[PDB]
Amino acid sequence: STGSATTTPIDSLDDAYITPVQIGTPAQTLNLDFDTGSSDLWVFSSETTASEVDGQTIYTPSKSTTAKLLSGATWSISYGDGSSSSGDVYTDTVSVGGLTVTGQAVESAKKVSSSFTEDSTIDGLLGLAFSTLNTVSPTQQKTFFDNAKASLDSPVFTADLGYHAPGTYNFGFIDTTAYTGSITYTAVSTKQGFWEWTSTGYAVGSGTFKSTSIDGIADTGTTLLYLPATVVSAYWAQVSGAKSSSSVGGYVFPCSATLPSFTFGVGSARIVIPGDYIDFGPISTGSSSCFGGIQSSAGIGINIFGDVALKAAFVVFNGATTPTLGFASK
């Protein structure tokens, strides 16, 4: 089997991407944030504290003939941006782009933090990191990908995120029309539960490539590119007037700037992030200070190849017995 679903930016900045997902019988379609940095499939629901729902579409298990309470199971998750959610668990039929999993754990939110409430466009998350990170207790649950894997034509999914445009998540096949040149594969460590890999270096604009190992995660659920302070300083030093602002919470730059590109290494291959991808616009409405899309990972404890990086590539998440990551230009 295979699946193919379009993913769409939630706003004009590509802050996140939503993908329609069918849950239950008859289908209830919710727009979920596919997150390769976490491993819970959770949804706004008929159980979510009413004051914490503001425009989201909810899953109502009582209206699904295939829903079953997973008795005694609870979940609770905290994300890198400090947001969180928690609740109980149903199993139900879940389909993505024509690919169906029966018995998928669907984590129903009883509580969500303010950032989730405030984002009316995101009805929940669909985790695509390794199932060892799943938070369901006392019986840990598998991700949608883990459950689908045996049925897939090939044990893979691909992320093809757009810049200010829709893109695609595919399951079970590699669309050879969706990228240019060849795919370069690189080793993954699953020790922390992430799609963790080592970039071979970077360049700023038309500058020379610096060969240096940068361990980080491929995380579709993080907006920006978070890299070591040395790398990030070297980038912003090439933008007149750019500075790190503690009051704003990172590097800012004059909105009048033309940003240089940023290149990262994948083995001997190179992925180029155009300068425009690094512009996250005014820090507040009407400001002439703009927020940068490359930020320091110092004090996160991990480097994160978030959407800024990933949307510059066609990315293969290879879930074979020895997992690997593939990157191609597009």
Side-chain angles (χ1 to χ4, degrees), residues 1-62 64-67 69-109 112-141 143-148 150-190 192-242 244-330:
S1 63
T2 62
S4 182
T6 299
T7 193
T8 302
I10 66 166
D11 62 23
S12 65
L13 299 178
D14 297 347
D15 281 315
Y17 297 77
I18 51 172
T19 308
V21 177
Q22 283 71 49
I23 308 174
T25 309
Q28 297 181 40
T29 298
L30 274 65
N31 297 326
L32 305 188
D33 184 352
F34 284 23
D35 181 13
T36 62
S38 68
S39 305
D40 288 50
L41 193 176
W42 75 259
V43 297
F44 280 78
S45 74
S46 57
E47 300 181 331
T48 310
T49 302
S51 64
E52 295 179 349
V53 183
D54 186 7
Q56 294 80 10
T57 295
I58 63 168
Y59 169 57
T60 303
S62 65
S64 172
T65 60
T66 42
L69 182 72
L70 186 62
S71 182
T74 58
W75 62 280
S76 181
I77 192 162
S78 300
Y79 297 100
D81 65 353
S83 65
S84 65
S85 53
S86 61
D88 55 17
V89 188
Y90 293 82
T91 56
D92 210 338
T93 303
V94 172
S95 300
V96 176
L99 170 66
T100 301
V101 169
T102 57
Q104 174 64 46
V106 177
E107 302 173 34
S108 169
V112 304
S113 66
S114 57
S115 286
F116 289 114
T117 299
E118 291 163 2
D119 194 349
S120 66
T121 65
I122 292 174
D123 302 324
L125 265 65
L126 189 149
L128 292 168
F130 293 89
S131 292
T132 54
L133 293 180
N134 176 266
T135 77
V136 177
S137 179
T139 308
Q140 190 173 57
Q141 301 295 303
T143 70
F144 174 82
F145 179 52
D146 211 338
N147 284 322
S151 302
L152 295 177
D153 291 356
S154 183
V156 304
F157 68 91
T158 65
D160 181 9
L161 303 178
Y163 167 67
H164 294 349
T168 306
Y169 282 101
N170 290 330
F171 292 82
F173 72 106
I174 287 164
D175 180 357
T176 59
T177 72
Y179 61 88
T180 59
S182 57
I183 306 177
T184 300
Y185 289 87
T186 195
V188 165
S189 173
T190 63
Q192 290 190 91
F194 299 120
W195 294 92
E196 187 172 2
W197 64 289
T198 302
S199 171
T200 49
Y202 70 98
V204 176
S206 61
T208 59
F209 187 84
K210 175 70 172 183
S211 294
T212 185
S213 294
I214 304 297
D215 180 288
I217 66 170
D219 184 2
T220 58
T222 292
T223 313
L224 308 184
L225 174 53
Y226 294 87
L227 292 173
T230 47
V231 178
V232 175
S233 181
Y235 178 81
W236 289 109
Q238 297 304 311
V239 179
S240 186
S244 185
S245 166
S246 52
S247 58
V248 177
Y251 281 90
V252 296
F253 67 93
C255 294
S256 61
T258 300
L259 298 177
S261 64
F262 184 91
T263 301
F264 63 94
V266 182
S268 58
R270 307 287 181 254
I271 300 294
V272 178
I273 306 171
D276 292 344
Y277 290 27
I278 299 161
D279 177 20
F280 279 75
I283 59 169
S284 296
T285 306
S287 179
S288 69
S289 183
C290 274
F291 197 70
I294 296 177
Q295 296 293 344
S296 178
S297 62
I300 294 179
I302 198 158
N303 301 304
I304 307 173
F305 294 86
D307 298 333
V308 164
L310 304 180
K311 74 183 165 203
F314 176 87
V315 187
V316 181
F317 294 78
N318 171 28
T321 307
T322 300
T324 65
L325 273 172
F327 292 82
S329 296
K330 68 186 184 191

